[PDB]
Design a protein around this ligand. Structure first.
Ligand SMILES: O=C(N[C@@H]1CNCCC[C@H]1OC(=O)c1ccc(O)cc1)c1ccc(O)cc1
Length: 335
C-alpha cells in the first residue's frame, strides 16, 4: 500500500537516527506506581511545565546489565521512538540518569485489559472481535516493519479513554527479517516453535493472537496448568477444547491461528494477514473504520480527569534512587 510504504520510510528514518535524551527527571512530578516489572516500574508522572500526565517507565541499568537483557532494553526503546500506529502507546520522551533508563509514555488511564477481562468475566464475541481487530491491524503494521512483538497478553494491552486498545511492553520486540531464536515471552502465550527451541518468525505473534482471542472470549487461556512444563505439553500437542458458547466462526479462526504447524497458520500463509482479515469471524468488521477509530467501542472506561489511577493497582511506593556515580554508561550509550 501507499500507507505501508509511508510507514516504512518514517520508521526507518527514526530507526537510523534515534531521538535520545529528550527530557530529564526534574521536569516531571512523581505521583504513583502504575505497574512494576523485571527491571523497574511504571509511574504516573506530571509534566511540571505542561501539566500533562505521562507514564514514566524507570529501569535500573544495573539489573538489566546483570540479567544480561541489554540488547532487548535498547531494542524496546529504539523500536518505540521509531514506530507510530493508533493502537500503540506513544513514547513521548526518553533519557537516562546515572542509575536508570527512562521512557515516558502517554498515560492511558483505562488501565490493563487484564483487569477488565477479569472483572467482566469474559468479553462478548463482538467485544473480543473489536479488540482483536485492532491487534490484527497493529500486527500488520509491526510485521511490515519487520518487527516481531513477542509478548501479546491482556496485561500488555491498555484500554484508552475511547475504549480502544493501546499496546505497550515492547521489551521483547525485535527487528527480524526472517527467523529469530530467543526464549522470550509468556508461557501461556508461547507458540510451539518457541517452546521447541526453533528459529521462529512473525507467526508466533499470530499464534498469540489465537491465545488472546480465546482468552478474551472464554475469560481464560486455551493452555493453562500449574507447571510451565505442563502448559508447554498442552501447546505443542496444541489440541484445543473450545467453550460451547463459542461460535462456529470463532472456533474456526482459532483453529487456524492456533495451528501448531507454522506453515499452515493464518498470518503466515501466502495470502498472509488477509486470511484473518477475510475470515467470517471478522465478516462484520470494517477494517478501516477500526483503524480510523470510527467504530463505537463496546466498553468505555469510567474516566475522571487526568491523573486518576483507579484502573491500576496499588504497589509499594519506593524511592527513585539516582546514584552519584554513573553506572553502566558504555552498555547503554546508544540509549
Ligand atoms: O507499560 C505500562 N505498564 C505495563 C503493563 N503491563 C504489565 C505490567 C508491566 C507494566 O510496565 C512495567 O511496570 C514494567 C515492565 C517491565 C519493566 O522492566 C519495568 C516496568 C504502561 C504504559 C503506559 C501507561 O500509560 C500505563 C502503563
Amino acid at each position: 500500500k501507499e500507507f505501508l510504504a509511508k510507514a516504512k520510510e518514517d520508521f526507518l528514518k527514526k530507526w537510523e537516527t534515534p531521538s535520545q535524551n529528550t527530557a530529564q527527571l526534574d521536569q516531571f512530578d512523581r505521583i504513583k506506581t502504575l505497574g512494576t516489572g523485571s527491571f523497574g516500574r511504571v509511574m504516573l508522572v506530571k509534566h511540571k511545565e505542561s501539566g500533562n500526565h505521562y507514564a514514566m517507565k524507570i529501569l535500573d541499568k544495573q539489573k538489566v546489565v546483570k540479567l544480561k537483557q541489554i540488547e532487548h532494553t535498547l531494542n524496546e526503546k529504539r523500536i518505540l521512538q521509531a514506530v507510530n500506529f493508533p493502537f500503540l502507546v506513544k513514547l513521548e520522551f526518553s533519557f537516562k540518569d546515572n542509575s536508570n533508563l527512562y521512557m515516558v509514555m502517554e498515560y492511558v488511564a483505562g488501565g490493563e485489559m487484564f483487569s477488565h477481562l477479569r472483572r467482566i468475566g469474559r468479553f462478548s464475541e463482538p467485544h473480543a472481535r473489536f479488540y482483536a481487530a485492532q491487534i490484527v491491524l497493529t500486527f500488520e503494521y509491526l510485521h511490515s516493519l519487520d518487527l516481531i512483538y513477542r509478548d501479546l497478553k491482556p496485561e500488555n494491552l491498555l484500554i484508552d479513554q475511547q475504549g480502544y486498545i493501546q499496546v505497550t511492553d515492547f521489551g521483547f520486540a525485535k527487528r527480524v527479517k526472517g527467523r529469530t531464536w530467543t526464549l522470550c515471552g509468556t508461557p501461556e502465550y508461547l507458540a510451539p516453535e518457541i517452546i521447541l527451541s526453533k528459529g521462529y518468525n512473525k507467526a508466533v505473534d499470530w499464534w498469540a493472537l489465537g491465545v488472546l482471542i480465546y482468552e478474551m472470549a472464554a475469560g481464560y487461556p486455551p493452555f493453562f496448568a500449574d507447571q510451565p512444563i505442563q502448559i508447554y505439553e498442552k501447546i505443542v500437542s496444541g489440541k484445543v477444547r473450545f467453550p460451547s458458547h463459542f461460535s462456529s466462526d470463532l472456533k474456526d479462526l482459532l483453529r487456524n491461528l492456533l495451528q501448531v504447524d507454522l506453515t499452515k497458520r493464518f498470518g503466515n500463509l501466502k495470502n498472509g494477514v488477509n486470511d484473518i482479515k477475510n475470515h467470517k469471524w471478522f465478516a462484520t468488521t470494517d477494517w478501516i473504520a477500526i483503524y480510523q477509530r470510527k467504530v463505537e467501542a463496546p466498553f468505555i472506561p469510567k474516566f475522571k480527569g487526568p491523573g486518576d489511577t483507579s484502573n491500576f493497582d496499588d504497589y509499594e511506593e519506593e524511592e527513585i534512587r539516582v546514584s552519584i556515580n554513573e553506572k553502566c554508561g558504555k552498555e547503554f550509550t546508544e540509549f
